[PDB]
Each structure stands twice: as C-alpha cells, then as structure tokens.
From Swiss-Prot, chain A:
It is found in: Virion. Coiled coil: none annotated. The record marks 29, 41 as: Involved in capsid protein dimerization upon acidification. The chain holds residues 390 to 465 of 701 of the full protein. Homodimer. Homomultimer. Homohexamer. It comes from Rous sarcoma virus subgroup C (strain Prague) (RSV-Pr-C). The gene is gag. This is Capsid protein p27, alternate cleaved 1.
Amino acid sequence: GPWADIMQGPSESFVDFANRLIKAVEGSDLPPSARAPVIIDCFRQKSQPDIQQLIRTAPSTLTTPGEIIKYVLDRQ
Amino acid sequence: PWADIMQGPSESFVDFANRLIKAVEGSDLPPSARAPVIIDCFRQKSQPDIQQLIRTAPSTLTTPGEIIKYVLDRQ
C-alpha cells in the first residue's frame, strides 16, 4: 500500500513524518493488528539518519508508535 | 497466535526464528506485514540477552535474515 513509500523528508520534522505515516497506515488495508509493527518498522528504516540512530538503541520494551514517538521527542 | 510467540529459555535462537517465521507465514497477515511482524517479535520477544544484542545492531540491518545472522554471529 501507499504508506510503504512514505519517507521522512530532509526538511521534514520527525513528528510530521510520524503523523503522516500513522494516518496512511491506519487508513490502509492492513489488519489493525499489523499496524503497530508496520509503523515502527517504517520509523526504524525510513526516518532521517539522526532519528534512525535514536530509534536503533531505544529500549526493547517500546512497542507502540506512541512510545517510540515520545522517546524520540524526548531526545529533541 | 503469532502475536503471543516468545523465545523459550531453552530454545535456541535459530529454532525460535524458524518457529516464528513459520507461524507468521501461515498466519492471516498480508505478505507486506510479515517482515515487520517478525522483526518486531525478534526485537521484543526474544530472550533478554538477545533483545539487548539486537538493540546494538546497525540500523542498516533491515530484513529478518540480516538480524538472524547478526545474532548467530555475536550471541
């Protein structure tokens, strides 16, 4: 689905990319149970380099998009 | 039931990985959700020392195969 092409732009903030991505995934054909893992995978892989490093070493207990967003925002 | 899968305290990583990949492939998930679901389960539901090892993995490891390899080489 189209959520799969979304990437954080070079002048785009993380929060804006996160909201954009989350809206696309929630409006997609994925079963609801696949949304959180899919969103977090996109955060890890398609965010800008600095964000990718923040998320890389995040605690392994942060399993929701909101948890990861907080973690990143706390480090900005 | 994929959603409840966790590595057992005596289960080798490779056996866990095969068990998990099998359950996910046979589940009612679209193919586009399979790799993210597997990687998430690795990152979050492996044994504690394995979760910490994956947390150190380069961000450039983006497929289940690449993570399995990293763990087998470094555990």
